[PDB]
Amino acid sequence: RPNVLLISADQWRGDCLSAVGHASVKTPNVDALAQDGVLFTRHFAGTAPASPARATLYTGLYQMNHRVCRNGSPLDARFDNLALAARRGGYDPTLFGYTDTAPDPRGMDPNDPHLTTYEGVLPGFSARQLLPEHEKQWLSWLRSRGHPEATSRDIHIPVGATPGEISDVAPAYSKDETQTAFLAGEFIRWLGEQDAPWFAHVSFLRPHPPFSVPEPYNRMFTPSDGPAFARAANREAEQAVHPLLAFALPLIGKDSFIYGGEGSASDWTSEDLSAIRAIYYGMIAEVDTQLGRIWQALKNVGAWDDTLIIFTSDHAEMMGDHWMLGKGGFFDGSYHVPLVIRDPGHPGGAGRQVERFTSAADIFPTLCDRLGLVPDNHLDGGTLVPFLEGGEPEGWRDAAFWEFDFRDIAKGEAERHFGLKSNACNLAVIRDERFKYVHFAGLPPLLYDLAKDPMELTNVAADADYAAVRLGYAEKLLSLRAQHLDQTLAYTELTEKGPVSRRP
Amino acid sequence: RPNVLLISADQWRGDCLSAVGHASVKTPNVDALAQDGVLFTRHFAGTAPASPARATLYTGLYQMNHRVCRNGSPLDARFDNLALAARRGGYDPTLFGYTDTAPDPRGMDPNDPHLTTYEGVLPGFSARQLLPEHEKQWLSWLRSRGHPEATSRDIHIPVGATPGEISDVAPAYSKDETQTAFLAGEFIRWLGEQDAPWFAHVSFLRPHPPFSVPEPYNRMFTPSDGPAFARAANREAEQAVHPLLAFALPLIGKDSFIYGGEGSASDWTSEDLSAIRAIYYGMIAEVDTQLGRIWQALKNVGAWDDTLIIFTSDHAEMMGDHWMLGKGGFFDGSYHVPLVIRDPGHPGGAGRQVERFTSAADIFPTLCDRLGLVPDNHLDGGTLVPFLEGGEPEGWRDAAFWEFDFRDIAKGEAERHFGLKSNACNLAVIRDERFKYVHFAGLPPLLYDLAKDPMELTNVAADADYAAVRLGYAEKLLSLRAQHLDQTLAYTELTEKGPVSRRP
Ligand SMILES: [Cl-]
Ligand SMILES: [Cl-]
Ligand SMILES: [Mg+2]
Ligand SMILES: [Mg+2]
């Protein structure tokens, strides 16, 4: 019955929405969706980076169940997902962009090109417009628009600017020529062809790096603007808190954030990071405008009040916090993501803001509930429908839970550095309103008193006065571990009258 | 190349072997196997009751991975096991007795009789002689031996004795007519037909209850004999230690231990339990005799020095300890099991006794190593081959690990009583030489100082002086949970050159 529109925009911070009180950041179209919908203020990714993070999103599972530890980790073919379930509800789930699903290699022919990347399409989606890392479909679209220069990703370098340098200058393409504008247009054309209830997933790359954007967004924000950075006085002191920080922070490269970047991101100053943030803030504004354009096209076709809109991000961005750029680790900056759900079918909950901890694992259970679908296996998340109704679900979680795995199957760098097996190269986070407890399978734990230290700069795990707090969170995490074991078959019992099952 | 003989005898205590220094118990044939083999002194079941315990044994997985929680919990069809692997090594794995495998109901026709019981056969085994709970095959064999009275399981009631009463009188059948004597004979006939390397699993019911045995075993031991019972002064003080004990202990029924038993086992006195133990000790002797008959049969055909023998039990028996009878819970009595491996291929370890912690989860990895087989998925156990070689494996575990789940899918009794969801009706045990830490997903934890309290009667979890010990074991258990997550696909990374994998 309703149309479903799942919109994701990569690497977008949960605190970077004007609707949540950001000083600098301007998100009017997200705000507009939240005015008529439910905004989730404590929404966390299941994990990081893109492939592990998206496996939570699409399967409704914690990394302890989906087992997608890194970009390139296969996702078991046994797992149900929102695309496959959508089809059991009579929809044809359609993709615009990417899912970053490494397929299950088992049984697949060794010569199959699908075995060579993590940039595969999630089973169940029908691809209308694909757009991988190579962006060849966008480049060819630019060529058809009068850009014979659009022959490579080099087109991302701002006009006249030095390759690999932070620049406020706009690239050769316009604001109506970004990958965002391209994908939105492709969605809008497809939307025009619809004559029945539709299911679409639009996956925008931006505000994910390279950090370059056309006019006006490039200069829309001043480097001096923006909130304080949640960081230690210096990089050395920051890294001294935990072995993982000492290992990971020096390895962050410039190439990952600026097109043509060379060397360590450690060579960028507080000023350089502030300049990057100004561009990032503009990039968020560019995606927001495109969302407005999507809202209008929905109204124009008369879909607006028949469409369940879910806007979110896979994982977020550190953006200078803790002298870091990118995703991964255990800090809030990398995991706290936006979530705005506009359900015209539940007007009761319109205008509301939810302060209960929510997970990316909750999206698939929400869709199942709302669309009257039954998942084919255990799910880790819970339905958000009671929050959309304007109420609160019974037995809801009281802390955010997420995981991060830093194993290296291909090169074994982290394993050699730490002197650990690949199965001990991980952490689990339990985070509520007062504390953050990080447990590492093979490194020391971390405990942050968010009341005293909201910036997470003081590890109090070894302080004797926090010993009982540390023990409490360790045992809470132990119950979470035990409760989230796979219940796919464990909720069934074979009796004399045949199988008997329980509903979660 | 070698023959494989996996022998299991249900509900046999690890301390009940004369080779380990038991005062009363007489196990000469197990001792004889151990004299020429490796005996494992700290061997623990992966879990209990029979179906959960056997899933660890056959799949080399901890319950956190196989998810077989209760008798009736399905075992996922995706899992590899010692019988499927044996076929990949050119063997025809043959079964005598039972595996207690509830099949994966998915895709199976709802009218299939296999969906009505947990007493299914493990995939990969070819059944030579089946013997389920109904024992109809043994009853018909008795009829053919001149027992027209053998028309029902009533034949287990001792001659003249009152049904449901502890009796040291022998039943109508002889020592050469037990289920043990029947199955051993069937194995011996099959053994004679072998002309190539063979793979057999002989699964004996005894010393599992009803506690009745023919002459001489019935009176071979005096109730007054036997070691001290590891129990509190009374049942009430026992049950007061933990909510699970207060729930479970009153529910133990007489029918589960004596044929025709009625009412609670709480109505049995210290004397009654000592009488039951005397019969149990005799039942162990009856099984040991049949092992000697098997060892002779192997010598007679010339297989003895070409056969890898693995003798063990699925789980143990409480046998009066903690005022309990049967299996389940968290006490040692229910999980410490025998393990004797005779490998003629490794004479370098013969006569040896191993004191490191071993698991039922280690059997399948051991067979894979020894027989040059590769498992099709992640395994939780480790190869015991380095111990058979006469050495020690590098990076072996410092503590025994086991789990127990008490959910009730069919009736929901435990769930209602405790006010817990089915996913929270479980515990995990971490047990070393000095401490036992039992964490419950939804009940209070337990901490036993085995150095001061080897009988497990004093819970010190709440004592402020043990706070750091409690924290240490909680974080150690957290590390295990993270390391034992499914690595089937997580040890693979999809690269430009295709898949790249790591070996555990
Ligand atoms: Cl600032
Ligand atoms: Cl062979
Ligand atoms: Mg991403
Ligand atoms: Mg058993």
UniProtKB/TrEMBL annotation, chains A, B:
This is Sulfatase (Sulfuric ester hydrolase) protein. The keyword Nucleus does not apply. One of its GO terms (cellular component) is cytoplasm. GO terms for molecular function: metal ion binding; sulfuric ester hydrolase activity. It comes from Rhizobium rhizogenes (strain K84 / ATCC BAA-868). Mg(2+) binds at residues 10, 50, 314-315. It comes from the Bacteria. PANTHER family: IDURONATE 2-SULFATASE (PTHR45953). Keywords: Hydrolase, Metal-binding. Pfam families: Sulfatase.
